[PDB]
Amino acid sequence: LKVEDGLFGTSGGIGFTKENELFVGRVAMIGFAASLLGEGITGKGILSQLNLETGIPIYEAEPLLLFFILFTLLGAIGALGDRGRFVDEPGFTKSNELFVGRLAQLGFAFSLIGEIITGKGALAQLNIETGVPINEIEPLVLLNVVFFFIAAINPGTGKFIT
Amino acid sequence: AKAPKKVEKPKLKVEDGLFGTSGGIGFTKENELFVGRVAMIGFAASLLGEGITGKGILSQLNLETGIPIYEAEPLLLFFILFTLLGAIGALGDRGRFVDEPFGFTKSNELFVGRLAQLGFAFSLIGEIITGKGALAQLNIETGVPINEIEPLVLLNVVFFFIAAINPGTGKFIT
Ligand SMILES: CCCCCCCCCO[C@@H]1O[C@H](CO)[C@@H](O)[C@H](O)[C@H]1O
Ligand SMILES: CCCCCCCCCO[C@@H]1O[C@H](CO)[C@@H](O)[C@H](O)[C@H]1O
Ligand SMILES: CCCCCCCCCO[C@@H]1O[C@H](CO)[C@@H](O)[C@H](O)[C@H]1O
Ligand SMILES: CCCCCCCCCO[C@@H]1O[C@H](CO)[C@@H](O)[C@H](O)[C@H]1O
Ligand SMILES: *N(C(=O)NC1CCCCC1)C1CCCCC1
Ligand SMILES: *N(C(=O)NC1CCCCC1)C1CCCCC1
Ligand SMILES: [Hg+2]
Ligand SMILES: [Hg+2]
Ligand SMILES: [Hg+2]
Numbered sequence A: 001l002k003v004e005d006g007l008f009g010t011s012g013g014i015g016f017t018k019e020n021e022l023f024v025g026r027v028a029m030i031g032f033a034a035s036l037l038g039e040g041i042t043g044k045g046i047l048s049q050l051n052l053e054t055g056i057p058i059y060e061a062e063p064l065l066l067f068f069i070l071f072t073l074l075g076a077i078g079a080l081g082d083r084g085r086f087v088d089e090p091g092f093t094k095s096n097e098l099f100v101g102r103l104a105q106l107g108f109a110f111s112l113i114g115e116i117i118t119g120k121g122a123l124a125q126l127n128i129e130t131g132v133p134i135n136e137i138e139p140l141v142l143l144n145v146v147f148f149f150i151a152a153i154n155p156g157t158g159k160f161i162t
Numbered sequence B: 001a002k003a004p005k006k007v008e009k010p011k012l013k014v015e016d017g018l019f020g021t022s023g024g025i026g027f028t029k030e031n032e033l034f035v036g037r038v039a040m041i042g043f044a045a046s047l048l049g050e051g052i053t054g055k056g057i058l059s060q061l062n063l064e065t066g067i068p069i070y071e072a073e074p075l076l077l078f079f080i081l082f083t084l085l086g087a088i089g090a091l092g093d094r095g096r097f098v099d100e101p102f103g104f105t106k107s108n109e110l111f112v113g114r115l116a117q118l119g120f121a122f123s124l125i126g127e128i129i130t131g132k133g134a135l136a137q138l139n140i141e142t143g144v145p146i147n148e149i150e151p152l153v154l155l156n157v158v159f160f161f162i163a164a165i166n167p168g169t170g171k172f173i174t
């Protein structure tokens, strides 16, 4: 009778609902897009912009940053709760939104770890990942940033059922 | 003898398929669970194999490590992408695991599987770029020496191997 969809798959009703996940997803979309944009403007990664130590081993990074990365990662895989469902109401649905937000969470956490280890932001990371110069990569990232801002605000169609 | 006709109550079209679709296309929680088991096995084998041989799994499988991502074999990249999308349920998460009317439940197993998928993909990317397997990576990450990190990894290996075999309690429902 009880669904196993809470914290770490529990059935006790503890943990995030799909709505909470969606919200955190929106915040992640905005944060990630603003990280990319911000690096485009300032030429520095978001951690360096916030004046957090970079180009260092993970264990020397700020514990709050590390716990934020852990939180983001565990959130992306729904380990903090995935309660209830999104159903079609009898062009993006709220589930699509949820997955855009999960992609955002993944990419964000990734770029953060990368900036901790190497000292380079998501843009430079993309350049080294692909081997394509920055000037050719910025128009695509800008399109991505716009999409993230759009999705972050887009309500999405469908309702949430416990 | 003849059954009373039951009236069609509004149907529930759930958005839990491939990238959240409702058309019923994508993995079920059972599929995800299986792929998760495969990831547990692969990850534990990577950690153990490196622990014994001192070489990363990609080095063992005769793949170029210490290269940029784009120069890497496209099947490896595709496997990593597949694992990452699977971990977040992007490839489908159809259905539910429910309690049956004291070990791991099927859902717990699913999440151990997703953690395994995450860690595996990360370790593979890292080995591609740096040329160091998961164990060496852990050593650099934590700053804990190999000798002090090995027992904890072995524990994690045994944990993943047992979980991979364990079916978990509960049943699957659409
Ligand atoms: C550094 C990160 C620290 C925070 C860890 C978050 C753990 C998840 C708890 O979830 C909460 O549990 C309630 C129980 O029902 C829900 O009702 C509620 O929606 C949700 O907010
Ligand atoms: C560190 C930044 C990110 C952490 C935020 C996680 C909190 C989860 C709560 O859920 C959301 O909270 C809002 C207000 O409580 C509501 O507007 C929204 O409807 C609800 O779904
Ligand atoms: C608001 C979105 C996220 C919060 C941003 C706050 C991060 C600002 C951190 O400041 C930096 O903290 C360092 C400690 O690591 C100090 O060493 C350094 O001198 C200081 O500049
Ligand atoms: C990429 C590495 C992993 C390979 C499999 C990925 C596709 C999902 C297949 O589904 C699973 O296949 C098993 C085959 O026997 C079944 O037992 C099981 O019931 C079923 O859920
Ligand atoms: N690629 C990326 O981050 N690759 C590596 C870089 C070193 C750290 C590990 C990952 C992309 C760039 C940022 C956007 C998402 C990933
Ligand atoms: N990995 C890392 O920093 N720590 C762990 C992550 C789990 C698997 C073992 C390594 C990084 C990922 C890519 C950048 C290089 C290492
Ligand atoms: Hg240190
Ligand atoms: Hg490159
Ligand atoms: Hg429910």
Ligand SMILES: [Hg+2]
Pocket (backbone or CB within 6 Å): B001, B002
């Ligand atoms: Hg009959």
Ligand SMILES: [Hg+2]
Pocket (backbone or CB within 6 Å): A131, B070, B071
């Ligand atoms: Hg190249």
Ligand SMILES: [Hg+2]
Pocket (backbone or CB within 6 Å): A057, B139, B140, B141, B142, B143
């Ligand atoms: Hg270190």
Ligand SMILES: [Hg+2]
Pocket (backbone or CB within 6 Å): B014, B095, B096, B173, B174
């Ligand atoms: Hg269902």
